[PDB]
Amino acid sequence: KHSLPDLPYDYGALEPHINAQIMQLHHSKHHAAYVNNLNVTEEKYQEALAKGDVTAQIALQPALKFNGGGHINHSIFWTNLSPNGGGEPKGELLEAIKRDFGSFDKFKEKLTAASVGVQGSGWGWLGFNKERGHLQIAACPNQDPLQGTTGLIPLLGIDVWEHAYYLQYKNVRPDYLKAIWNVINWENVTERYMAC
Amino acid sequence: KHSLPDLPYDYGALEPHINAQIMQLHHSKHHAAYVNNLNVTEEKYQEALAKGDVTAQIALQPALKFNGGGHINHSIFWTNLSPNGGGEPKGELLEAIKRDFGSFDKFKEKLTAASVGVQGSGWGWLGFNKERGHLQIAACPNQDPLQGTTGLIPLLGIDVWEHAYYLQYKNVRPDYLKAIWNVINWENVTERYMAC
């Protein structure tokens, strides 16, 4: 079974950039629902697979991608943030950013643009393309996970579902994105980059 | 050009079911952005069409469906609500509800279910199918308008984008849906039904 990971920090550790109420709801309510629904759905899938029921397997795909994706995305997201985050990357990672995007600022600009431009609910991602060996920016709708649907290895994710910022920034996504740069855990992003 | 319609009531007229802050933001910020972006996009489309630029026409489709859909959906939504709303329909409409769904309560149940079940942002609709001459429940993702994408004539719409309820009901959509039944303008839904 899958389980809700514990936050590596306190709910209010990202203040004033992301207030405690959002973190608490996001983690204990939203993420929890996905994990629970993921376990229920995998349960039904194992049953459909055992009986070789193809129709059931196919009918179950949206639920599995949605809840499975939700679990994967949020688990990575929590580790992407840190009260000691912010600033800029250093070393091999920063070098790859300059190489693939021109400069750190152009990178920020393109990731911010891809994130603000999502129509409806979704995610903005900085991913690694193993085939080409270069960094790449992508946006995924709803809870569609990056690796599972595009093949890219996720390094940094930005949740742009309205529940991720509405209580604090209302309809102004740009403000939310501007603020989230201050708590990004580049140390974690770097580890994910090195791992591949 | 298209323009932001005025609300037929005060921002706080739907209290306590939908508070004034949501109505104000929803109407003056969210809806306004769609109308503005719709006019800009139609402007570019007329230009692409004049020069017979097919590539430009196709590249512009997401923006036009998203902002155009947003304008259409919200314009109908405002008229679907009323401080004097709630209760049950009467006459031909109520008769068609019983005929097509069994009873008013089964209708409420199915519309509520379709609305709560939207994954990500979307809408729950009670529509009229002209070909078959029966009522039908449908759910549309993001801002995809009902008639334009399914052919059904929209009668009653329920916005389930998180911005429509988060400030007041947080993550609990069921509470939001339970509350919205109290301010539904059945008089307007009936007119839309008669019109076709």
Ligand SMILES: [K+]
């Ligand atoms: K797990």
Ligand SMILES: [K+]
């Ligand atoms: K108009």
Ligand SMILES: [Mn+2]
């Ligand atoms: Mn989220």
Ligand SMILES: [Mn+2]
């Ligand atoms: Mn809306």
